[PDB]
């Protein structure tokens, strides 16, 4: 089995200089990217960038872009966030995921279970509702939208409390292995949605969508999906 770990978070003073690991196992470790995707306490997601395979070139965000340095060692089969003058907004949990070896696959497979960090012009994704309560048995439908057209390269993970996200779907419509039937999804262009005909317990999670048409990789802000009694009023925002 895939296994991803990350290590070296610790709390650290605003102004120092920390890095990160992704021990990586159970695969061949040069076929795959690696990427870093950090969270914000009771925030999204936010991609921090990724190495490559086969050309090992890193790609950032803008928004850490010339600050943080991603590396690769293929003889230790760990990739390395190194984060530099520290402050406030990179109080996160951080994560490195696998990107599968395609060329238009930059979505994540795999992801560690994260180290937390605490300091003492793209394509934006918008999701609705941010907030929504439903019941068990439901049909619940959330809607992703692209502020322009991505083809079908949309992704989406059902995120649980203190658990990394897990991809759900891919491709706007390619169901992941080991992801049940009451999930679907649909689209192209700029409207994307993803549906679960019927609501079991372990179904009451955050769903974020993601974007891979274009660099930067871009997360929406998140839909997060709360339990209600059948008797209760039905609410989403």
């Known amino acids: 089995e895939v296994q991803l770990v990350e290590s070296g978070g610790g709390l650290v003073q605003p102004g120092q200089s920390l890095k990160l690991s992704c021990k990586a196992s159970?695969?061949?470790?040069?076929?795959?990217?690696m990427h870093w995707v950090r969270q914000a306490p009771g925030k999204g997601l936010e991609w921090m960038g990724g190495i490559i395979p086969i050309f090992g070139t890193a790609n950032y965000n803008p928004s850490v872009k010339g600050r943080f340095t991603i590396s690769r060692d293929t003889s230790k089969n760990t990739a390395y966030l190194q984060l530099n003058n520290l402050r406030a907004e990179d109080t996160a949990v951080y994560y490195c995921a696998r990107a599968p070896g395609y060329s238009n696959a930059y979505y994540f497979d795999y992801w560690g279970q994260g180290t937390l960090v605490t300091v003492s012009s793209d394509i934006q994704m918008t999701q609705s509702p941010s907030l929504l309560s439903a019941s068990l048995g439901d049909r619940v439908t959330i809607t992703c939208r692209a502020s322009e057209g991505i083809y079908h390269w949309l992704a989406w993970y059902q995120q649980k409390p203190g658990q990394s996200p897990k991809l759900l779907i891919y491709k706007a419509s390619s169901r992941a292995s080991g992801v049940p039937d009451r999930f679907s999804g649909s689209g192209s262009g700029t409207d994307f949605t993803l549906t679960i005909s019927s609501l079991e317990p372990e179904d009451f999670a955050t769903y974020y969508c993601?974007?891979?048409?274009?660099?930067?990789?871009?997360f929406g802000g998140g839909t997060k999906l709360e339990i209600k009694a059948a008797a209760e009023n039905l609410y989403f925002q």
């Open positions: 993601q974007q891979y048409s274009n660099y930067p990789l871009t």
């Open positions: 159970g695969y061949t470790f040069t076929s795959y990217g």
